[PDB]
Design a binder for this molecule. Sequence first.
Ligand SMILES: *CC(=O)N1CCC=CC[C@H]1c1ccc(OC)cc1
Length: 186
Amino acid sequence: SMLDDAKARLRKYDIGGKYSHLPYNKYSVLLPLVAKEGKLHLLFTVRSEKLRRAPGEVCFPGGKRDPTDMDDAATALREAQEEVGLRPHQVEVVCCLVPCLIDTDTLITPFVGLIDHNFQAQPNPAEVKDVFLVPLAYFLHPQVHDQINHIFEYTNPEDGVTYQIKGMTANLAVLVAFIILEKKPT
Ligand SMILES: *CC(=O)N1CCC=CC[C@H]1c1ccc(OC)cc1
């Protein structure tokens, strides 16, 4: 099936806990895969304008590890719940992708999660200004704008709203698209 095939692909790139003990400032993100109309989508947030770090920016759900978290995956799930109302029974964490090194002292660990079909996002306005889906296939043929570095523009056909996706977030979206969609029969 589509979902079984995505999970089997993703598992081949799972690094697991290999990098998880290293003495970094630790953040985790959840790459939430949602199946709609027979195709996979990624769920993104727009961060609230009010926040200290990264205001107004398009990010996957996530944030800084805290002492309650059992592990790095727990961080990602906690932050997803606070930001968009995603409960742990509504997500299957499939794998841990390559971590991202930032600022010499920070390690960001991405986890890919399969999202239950009955999940309905409840944006928390203290954390997130918007939540939106992009079809995974988009990241194979994105609409690129050079601001000099590359920015993706995605226009939702439901309402014509354009979103700008860039940086680590854009890079991770492309990675997941390649993993799941490369070399597939039609
Ligand atoms: C957009 C995003 O995922 N994050 C991670 C967790 C919450 C705020 C920081 C933000 C971020 C990650 C990576 C970079 O690299 C330049 C910048 C912001």
